[PDB]
Design a protein around this ligand. Structure first.
Ligand SMILES: Nc1nc2c(ncn2[C@@H]2O[C@H](COP(=O)(O)OP(=O)(O)OP(=O)(O)O)[C@@H](O)[C@H]2O)c(=O)[nH]1
Ligand SMILES: [Mg+2]
Lengths: 73, 55, 73, 74, 81, 98, 82, 105, 418, 77
């Protein structure tokens, strides 16, 4: 079952996931939109600095040159 | 004043076809061997006679 | 890009990303800002004049250029 | 427009690669792409600690490649 | 493209801060399509060093962090394609 | 790219259903935006317009960074800015506090 | 293609010295160079950042990690630079 | 070197034709394999494929390439009519066989 | 000193002699009248802007005696030193020796093969292999030089024989097969196979400035259309290989019965069409062809006669002779590499001597060893100038040297002077 | 010869225990099982886990989508 990453990001859009960036900080939120260039838009996310909560910020557009990876739960 | 001329190539082909009697069928200077101006000048300077040439 | 056609043969200073200094005669450039400089001197900060000669600089490590001296005869 | 790198001289030879964070690796070159991604057979690890770990057939992305070194004479 | 917007703003006394923290105060002269900025009347205050005077400056467009524009610039008539 | 057409209006459909549409509401509804950028700075203001490279124009901004002594956050006012798009971590529409 | 790449192809066969992003200076005879700055070099004297001098006989440098190159001085009479 | 030019006797033949005056060529390599497929881009064509191999003026243009002066030219100056010897080739080439003695003299 | 205008600086030629990897020592030879001196004329006109051929006569830049001008044949082998660019754009130093092709002056070629490393054999495409070509293949192989073959006068396949394209291909292939046979008869080395696939055979017309291998014409395709690997595309333009226009691939079987070979389809028929549209159709369809190939001519340039106009069109189309430089760089060794068989064959006492290992490195400093083979006269005829090559060391103006004759030994020491 | 995308295709055929290295991150490496790739070498992992070099605490990651601009070495076991 060959599952490419592009139908993975266009198929599971809407699930509450967490993105992790290059600096090591983590965004908990559900994915709103994603393009073919793999920029991402997620809503009402939460900020974990090294697993520790910092504060409330809002909904985030994330760019290609900032993200490390995208995992679930 | 009627000094210079330039034609097209079918014109030159037709004028070359009509003039086929006054022209030779030669293609190269392998003809005139020992029968050109320099050989005649050499036979002039050496006082000998080429067969067919002048005296 | 005629603003660099005006800068031809000038004795120009070049600042790198690490903070070093390339001073050379502006011989040639391209679209990727790759420099051909002749009779080049390197300045770093303790100050020292480090003679190089003919330098081909890659555009990925160049920040900003400025003009120091007129073209010699 | 992306021309492939001329790595025909280094085929099936033992080469050591340098990677970004002072990293070092060795092995046999087996091919390339026009993006300079390299396939390496018999890949031993050889980190900065000093202990050697063989892996096998691996792929190095070209963006972290610093330098090639041909240990065998090409 | 906004970079084509940037070449419509010649001869304006703006400041440029780069990715190294260096600040440049001067009148902008030329903008390339790759944001290669050609500047004159340069007051260049480098980070943790002394500010200097320069006559002609040429900044490569990749290392630009941001620009700072004065108060009297009517951009509402300048963002028209 | 498999779309070589000259009539290229996908980049504004990118601005409507894609990820960049976050900025277009701040173009249209004129909301406050917060920007975290690469040398750890926080820029709060109002963006006017932008492109696919996120080269943005901002107005009436306050930008903050901390200094180390021990880290204390300082702030400064700038009336208008142009911001290059590769010089950001994140762009943030500020939520409805109400 | 522009002028500095043609100057790079002209310096093949002579002795050049390159410094890359890891601060290492490699001096020796340039063998091959492409449109991009992938440089195949041989008979290389190697100066690290600390100061150790090494001898490496076949080096292939990726052009992405290169800071700059230093060329011979007799290339100021090359045809593309005149 | 011997000019090997062959005259055209039929206007309906093609200009480039294997004339049987020419001796026949007695008919009989590291070629790569088909599987390493080198594909050209779609708009790449051989040069000048719209123009034909020959036209009606080709063989005449080849025949005028070996014509004597002035029939190999296409531009020149006019000459005054008494300076054109029409018989100079005739006594310049050789003597034909079978002529009498006074003709040779 | 005064010098004619040259496209390169003379200081560049002065500084290029110091690197023995960028120098090639080439001898051009062949049978009588197959196009050597006109090829040298084309190279000289390539390097000099102010030297141009007359519209009616040949130039003959390297025939400097009056006997060669009155006889029309070559008598003395003449050297020339130029700087030429290749396909990739890199400049190279060429020392070219033009030797006569007449058999009774074969001694002028043997004096030329002693001071050089490579042989370029010119062969007439119409006549083919002749007597002196067959003798010079043997004489160039037994003297242990590299051999490349250029097939000159291909337009005699077009404008004299009026020959069909596949028949001209068969003529060229028969010439190359006879050359490979004459190589394999006298050689014991099997790595001397000559073929255009290896970049080893060139094609040329000296009268109209045509010179190409497969790689240069592939570079012409790459400059015209773009995004084509020319070094891979040039590997399939010879032999029984066919272009299939449906799949756009190169297959070894015939798609149709009218399918031509790749060399006929991509190279030889555009050459026929260029020559045909210049010669036969200058008046009607030549501007359409010159607009199609991307060549612009002045209105005064269109009013020329047929042969200078064909030379001008082929010179604007093909341009610089980069394929010849590619062949002479790829298949003729530098004097730094090929010094060892030269010292092994030409130096008495063997290469295993103490001085032989010093000369085998081509060291520009150290012991001076030069070998002069040719003597040239001045204008007055009162004194001669020696001509040779420098095997080792560096010779200086004003340096006292020792001249050793052909009767000198270490035992005698009589035939020597300072 | 071997090109790297055919070996990534062989990796997704073999579903091997692929350990991925990272750009500029000398300590933190990730074990995983590859499923698919793309033209810019973005890689999904079925059961990914994080292994440091000074801490070495194995934490669960699940099916991740690691980008192309971060990876250095795709090694096995
Ligand atoms: N048709 C045609 N004739 C040519 C070509 N190249 C040379 N010739 C002619 O052939 C004749 C002899 O050319 P040269 O170059 O003098 O012959 P050569 O090889 O120097 O003779 P050597 O003195 O033995 O060296 C001249 O009339 C040239 O114009 C060519 O490409 N095509
Ligand atoms: Mg000659």
């Amino acid at each position: 079952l060959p599952l490419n990453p592009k139908p993975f990001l266009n198929g599971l859009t809407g699930k509450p996931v967490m993105v992790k960036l290059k600096w090591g900080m983590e965004y908990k939120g559900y994915l709103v939109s994603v393009d073919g260039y793999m920029n991402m838009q997620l809503a009402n996310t939460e900020e974990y600095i090294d697993g520790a909560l910092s504060g409330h910020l809002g909904e985030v557009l994330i760019r290609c040159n900032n993200v490390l990876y995208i995992r679930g739960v | 004043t009627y000094q210079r001329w330039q034609f097209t190539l079918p014109m030159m082909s037709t004028l070359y076809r009509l003039a086929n009697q006054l022209l030779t069928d030669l293609v190269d200077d392998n003809y005139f061997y020992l029968f050109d101006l320099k050989a005649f000048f050499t036979s002039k300077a050496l006082n000998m006679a080429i067969p067919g040439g002048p005296k | 890009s005629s603003k660099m056609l005006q800068h031809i043969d000038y004795r120009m200073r070049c600042i790198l990303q690490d903070g070093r200094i390339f001073i050379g005669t502006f011989k040639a450039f391209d679209k990727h800002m790759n420099l051909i400089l002749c009779d080049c001197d390197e300045f770093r900060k303790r100050e020292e004049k480090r003679v190089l000669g003919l330098v081909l600089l890659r555009g990925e490590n160049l920040v900003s250029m400025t003009v120091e001296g007129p073209p010699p005869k | 427009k992306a021309h492939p790198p001329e790595l025909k001289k280094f085929m099936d030879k033992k080469l050591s690669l340098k990677l970004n964070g002072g990293r070092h690796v060795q092995g046999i070159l087996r091919g390339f792409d026009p993006f300079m991604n390299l396939v390496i057979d018999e890949c031993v690890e050889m980190a900065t600690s000093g202990q050697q770990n063989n892996i096998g057939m691996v792929v190095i992305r070209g963006n972290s490649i610093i330098m090639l070194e041909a240990l065998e004479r090409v | 493209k906004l970079v084509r917007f940037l070449m419509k703003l010649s001869h304006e006394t703006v400041t440029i801060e780069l990715k190294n923290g260096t600040q440049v105060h001067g009148t902008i002269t030329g903008v390339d399509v790759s944001m290669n900025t050609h500047l004159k009347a340069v007051k260049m205050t480098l980070k943790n060093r002394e500010p200097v005077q320069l006559e002609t400056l040429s900044i490569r467009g990749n290392n630009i962090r941001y620009f700072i524009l004065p108060d009297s610039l009517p951009l509402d008539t300048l963002l028209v394609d | 790219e498999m779309t070589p057409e000259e009539l290229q209006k996908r980049e504004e459909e990118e601005f409507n259903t894609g990820p960049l549409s976050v900025l277009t509401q701040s173009v249209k509804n004129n909301t406050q935006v917060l920007i975290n950028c690469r040398n750890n700075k926080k820029l709060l203001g109002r963006v006017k317009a932008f492109d696919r490279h996120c080269n943005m124009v901002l107005e009436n901004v306050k930008e903050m960074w901390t200094e180390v002594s021990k880290p204390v956050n300082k702030d400064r006012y700038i009336s208008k800015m142009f911001l290059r798009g590769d010089s950001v971590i994140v762009v943030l529409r500020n939520p409805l506090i109400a | 293609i522009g002028v500095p790449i043609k100057v790079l192809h002209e310096a093949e066969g002579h002795i050049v010295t390159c410094e890359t992003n890891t601060g290492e200076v490699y001096r020796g005879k340039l063998i091959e160079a492409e449109d991009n700055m992938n440089c195949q070099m041989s008979n290389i004297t190697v100066t690290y950042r600390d100061g150790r001098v090494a001898q490496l006989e076949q080096v292939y440098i990726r052009g992405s990690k290169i800071r700059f190159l230093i060329l011979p001085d007799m290339l100021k009479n090359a045809p593309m630079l005149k | 070197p011997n000019v090997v030019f062959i005259k055209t006797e039929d206007p309906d033949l093609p200009a480039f034709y294997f004339d049987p005056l020419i001796n026949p060529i007695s008919h009989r390599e590291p070629l790569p394999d088909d599987d390493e497929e080198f594909e050209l881009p779609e708009f790449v064509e051989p040069f000048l494929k719209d123009t034909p191999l020959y036209t009606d003026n080709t063989a005449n243009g080849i025949a005028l390439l070996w014509a004597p002066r002035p029939f190999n030219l296409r531009s020149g100056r006019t000459r005054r009519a008494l300076d054109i010897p029409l018989v100079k080739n005739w006594y310049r080439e050789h003597c034909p066989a079978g002529q009498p003695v006074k003709v040779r003299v | 000193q005064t010098l004619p205008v040259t496209v390169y600086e003379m200081d560049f030629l002065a500084d290029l002699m110091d690197n023995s990897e960028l120098i090639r020592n080439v001898t051009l030879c062949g049978h009588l009248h197959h196009g050597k001196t006109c090829f040298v004329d084309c190279l000289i006109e390539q390097t000099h802007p102010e030297i141009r051929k007359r519209y009616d006569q040949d130039l003959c830049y390297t025939d400097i005696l009056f006997t060669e001008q009155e006889r029309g044949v070559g008598i003395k082998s003449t050297p020339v030193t130029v700087v030429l660019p290749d396909t990739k754009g890199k400049s190279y130093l060429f020392n070219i020796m033009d030797t006569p092709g007449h058999v009774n002056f074969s001694d002028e070629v043997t004096a030329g093969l002693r001071i050089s490393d490579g042989v370029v054999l010119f062969i007439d495409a119409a006549e083919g292999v002749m007597l002196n070509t067959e003798r010079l293949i043997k004489h160039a192989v037994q003297e242990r030089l590299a051999v490349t073959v250029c097939i000159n006068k291909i337009d005699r396949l077009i404008l004299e024989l009026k020959l069909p394209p596949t028949d001209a291909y068969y003529k060229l292939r028969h010439i190359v097969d006879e050359v490979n046979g004459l190589i394999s008869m006298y050689s014991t080395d099997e790595n001397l196979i000559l073929s255009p696939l290896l970049g080893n055979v060139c094609f040329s017309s000296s009268q109209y400035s045509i010179c190409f291998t497969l790689g240069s014409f592939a570079k012409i395709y790459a400059d015209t259309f773009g995004d084509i690997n020319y070094q891979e595309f040039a590997k399939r333009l010879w032999g029984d290989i066919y272009f299939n226009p449906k799949t756009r691939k190169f297959t070894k079987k015939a798609p149709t019965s009218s399918s031509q070979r790749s060399f006929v389809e991509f190279i030889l028929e555009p050459l026929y069409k260029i020559l045909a549209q210049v010669v036969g159709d200058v008046d009607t369809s030549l501007p359409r062809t010159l607009d199609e190939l991307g060549i612009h001519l002045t209105k005064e340039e269109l009013k020329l006669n047929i042969r200078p106009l064909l030379r001008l069109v082929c010179k604007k189309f093909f341009g610089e002779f980069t394929g010849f430089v590619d062949m002479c760089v790829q298949h003729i060794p530098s004097p730094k590499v090929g010094a060892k068989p030269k010292i092994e064959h030409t130096y008495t006492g063997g290469v295993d001597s103490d001085l032989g290992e010093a000369m085998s490195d081509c060291d520009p400093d150290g012991p001076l060893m030069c070998h002069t083979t040719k003597m040239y006269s001045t204008d007055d005829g009162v004194q001669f100038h020696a001509f040779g090559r420098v095997l080792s060391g560096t010779i200086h103006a004003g340096q006292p040297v020792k001249v050793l004759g052909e009767n000198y030994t270490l035992e005698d020491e009589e035939d020597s002077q300072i | 010869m071997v090109q790297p995308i055919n070996l990534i295709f062989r990796y997704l055929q073999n579903r091997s225990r692929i350990q991925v290295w990272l750009y500029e991150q000398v300590n933190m490496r990730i074990e995983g099982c590859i499923i698919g790739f793309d033209e810019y070498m973005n890689l999904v992992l079925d059961d990914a886990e994080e292994i440091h070099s000074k801490t070495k605490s194995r934490k669960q990651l699940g099916r991740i989508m690691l980008k192309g601009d971060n990876i250095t070495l795709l090694q096995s076991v």
